[PDB]
UniProtKB/Swiss-Prot annotation:
Name the record gives this protein: Antifungal protein B
BP-aspect Gene Ontology terms: defense response to fungus; killing of cells of another organism
UniProt organism field: Penicillium rubens (strain ATCC 28089 / DSM 1075 / NRRL 1951 / Wisconsin 54-1255) (Penicillium chrysogenum)
Family per record: Belongs to the antifungal protein pafB family.
Functional note: Antifungal protein that acts as an inhibitor of growth of human pathogenic molds and yeasts.
GO CC field: extracellular region; host cell cytoplasm
UniProt keyword terms in alphabetical order: Antimicrobial, Disulfide bond, Fungicide, Host cytoplasm, Secreted, Signal
Part of the intact protein present: 36 to 92 of 92
Length: 57
């Protein structure tokens, strides 16, 4: 189960909506996972606690 959202450049986080609430998760440090473009689409994989903040739409 993956959840899509928008990343914050300043915070290096992925923001997403789930269950009527806002959530925020750390993008991480990999060069291909950190938030590099403000509000870029990002994905949070709940099963494996992995986040990718460079996933194109
Ligand atoms: Zn922050
Ligand atoms: Zn949450
Ligand atoms: Zn892009």
């Amino acid at each position: 189960s993956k959840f899509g959202g928008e990343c914050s450049l300043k915070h290096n986080t992925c923001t997403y909506l789930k269950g009527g609430k806002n959530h925020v998760v750390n993008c991480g440090s990999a060069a291909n996972k950190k938030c590099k473009s403000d509000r870029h689409h990002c994905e949070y994989d709940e099963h494996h606690k992995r986040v990718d903040c460079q996933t194109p739409v």
